[PDB]
């Protein structure tokens, strides 16, 4: 079963960052999304009480203007500045986007579920320029839900320009909602490291509640920080409060030309980095990564990771989400669809497109592109694929995967019945080329790929 390098690149990319199922990664136990979610919510606490799951919540938040004391003992209180307020609201929004939560600001003497405030000194009254931030779990105790940040840190004062600040806000709010660090560790306590992680997926690539960089799991964000909930965070927060099915239910576009009105899902130009795990509750959606020149690998399968804009493992799709279309850039990309009907556009460069199950429409774009098929279920007659811009003598249709059940043979105009034969039929009236494949074990011809344009036998890889 010697398959092509194109098929192999798809086969391997589909297994990129496989997790759970008794696997061992980095010498650690591998957790599935749900296992990581249960670990992150191990304190079993939320604003609805203890051991209460799938229950929505309407919460209040406040930017403290003064304090009688900070619950931690720290001192030198400083209220949130305008930039911190705006970024904190964006962090709150990134959480309410995915879970059934509503946030309403309160002012004056009114109490609030979640509060924000800065500190600058320790209990002894000495300047603290080393710590970052901390927050308290939901509860009925003094300080529950309060979050605090070190004003002496520039990233805390300028969260809109220093990415770690925004990520810190999202992280802290996570605690204020009931989420814990993926492992038993905290700042100030000894000096933990990724080696102390309970499971392999305890890193920024999977959870912003982690303490470890995305590099620990093989990802690379080139010095950037995502700022929004990642895949395991989304599953975790939804475990506690339920999923928000009213978010972006229309046709949504992520990346370039985005209509999300969310900075973390938007790329205004090629120099912008994208780091996100998408939550989308409906409609026909598109991953538009057309503005990059880097060779990208885009996967539309729920729960999967993609390598976008030169970064590694920076984009993922949350469990329970179906993204339909993808657009690559000028680089040599790999686009992998899911079981839904996908429209894939490779763009310039030599791309590898794989529609998977469902009736997909594929555009290789300029360049020497390869349209890959891994099984007869990829393009059944009842839901056939369309390759709309095939270039005879330039593009290729890869059927090497069918070798695992016998080498495919080319027939000119008739099937013998022996099976495992491929045929190209030209429809002069419509200028359409029908690619028929009579697969072994199939009494009837059940595989068909319709091509808008001419195709030669030498363009078909068997
Ligand atoms: Ca949508
Ligand atoms: Ca969708
Ligand atoms: Ca491309
Ligand atoms: Ca598909
Ligand atoms: Ca192309
Ligand atoms: Ca092409
Ligand atoms: Ca298909
Ligand atoms: Zn923390």
Swiss-Prot record:
Cite the Gene3D superfamilies for this sequence: Collagenase (Catalytic Domain), Serralysin-like metalloprotease, C-terminal
Repeat region (Hemolysin-type calcium-binding), residues = 327-344, 345-362, 363-380
Kindly give the Pfam families that the UniProt entry links to this protein: HemolysinCabind, Peptidase_M10, Peptidase_M10_C
Q: Could you give the cofactor binding note from the entry?
A: Binds 7 Ca(2+) ions per subunit. Binds 1 zinc ion per subunit.
- Binding of Ca(2+) 5: at which residues? 347, 349, 351, 364, 366, 369
Query: What is the enzyme's class at the highest EC level?
Result: hydrolase
Kindly list the positions annotated as binding Ca(2+) 4: 338, 340, 342, 355, 360
Identify this protein by name: Serralysin C
Q: Which organism is it from?
A: Dickeya chrysanthemi (Pectobacterium chrysanthemi)
Which taxonomic lineage does the organism of this UniProt entry have?
Bacteria, Pseudomonadati, Pseudomonadota, Gammaproteobacteria, Enterobacterales
């Amino acid at each position: 079963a010697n398959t092509s390098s194109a098929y192999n690149s798809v086969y391997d990319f589909l297994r990129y960052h496989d997790r759970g199922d008794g696997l061992t990664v980095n010498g650690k136990t591998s957790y599935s999304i749900d296992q990581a979610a249960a670990q992150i919510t191990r304190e079993n606490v939320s604003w609805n009480g203890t051991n209460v799951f799938g229950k929505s919540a309407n919460l209040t938040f406040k930017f403290l203007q003064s304090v009688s004391s900070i619950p931690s003992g720290d001192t030198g209180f400083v209220k949130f500045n305008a930039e911190q307020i705006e970024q904190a609201k964006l962090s709150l929004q990134s959480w309410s986007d995915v879970a059934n939560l509503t946030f309403t600001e309160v002012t004056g003497n009114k109490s609030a579920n979640i509060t924000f405030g800065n500190y600058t000194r320790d209990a002894s009254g000495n300047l603290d320029y080393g710590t970052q931030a901390y927050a308290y779990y939901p509860g009925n105790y003094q300080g529950a839900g309060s979050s605090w940040y070190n004003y002496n840190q520039s990233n805390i004062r300028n969260p809109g320009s220093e990415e770690y600040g925004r990520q810190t806000f999202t992280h802290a709010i996570g605690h204020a909602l009931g989420l814990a660090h993926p492992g038993e560790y905290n700042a100030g306590e000894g000096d933990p490291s990724y080696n102390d992680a309970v499971y392999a997926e305890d890193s920024y690539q999977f959870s912003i509640m982690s303490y470890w960089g995305e590099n620990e799991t093989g990802a690379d964000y080139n010095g950037h920080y995502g700022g929004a909930p990642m895949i395991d965070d989304i599953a975790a927060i939804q475990r506690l409060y339920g999923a928000n099915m009213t978010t972006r239910t229309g046709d949504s576009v992520y990346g370039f030309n985005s209509n999300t009105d969310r900075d973390f899902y938007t790329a205004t130009d090629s120099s912008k980095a994208l780091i996100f795990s998408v939550w989308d509750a409906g409609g026909t959606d598109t991953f538009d990564f057309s503005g990059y020149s880097n060779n990208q690998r885009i996967n539309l399968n729920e729960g999967s990771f993609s390598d976008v804009g030169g970064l590694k493992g920076n984009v993922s799709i949350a469990h329970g989400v179906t993204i339909e279309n993808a657009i690559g850039g000028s680089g040599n990309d790999i686009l992998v669809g899911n079981s839904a009907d996908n429209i894939l556009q490779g763009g310039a460069g030599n791309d590898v497109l794989y529609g998977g199950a469902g009736a997909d429409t594929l555009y290789g774009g300029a360049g020497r592109d390869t349209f890959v098929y891994g099984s007869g279920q990829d393009s059944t007659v009842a839901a056939y694929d369309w390759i709309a811009d095939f270039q005879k003598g330039i593009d290729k249709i890869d059927l090497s995967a069918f070798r695992n059940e016998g080498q495919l043979s080319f027939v000119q105009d008739q099937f013998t019945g022996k099976g495992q034969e491929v045929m190209l039929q030209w429809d002069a009236a419509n200028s359409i080329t029908n690619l028929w494949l009579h697969e072994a074990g199939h009494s009837s011809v059940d595989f068909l790929v319709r091509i808008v344009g001419q195709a030669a036998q030498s363009d078909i890889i068997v």
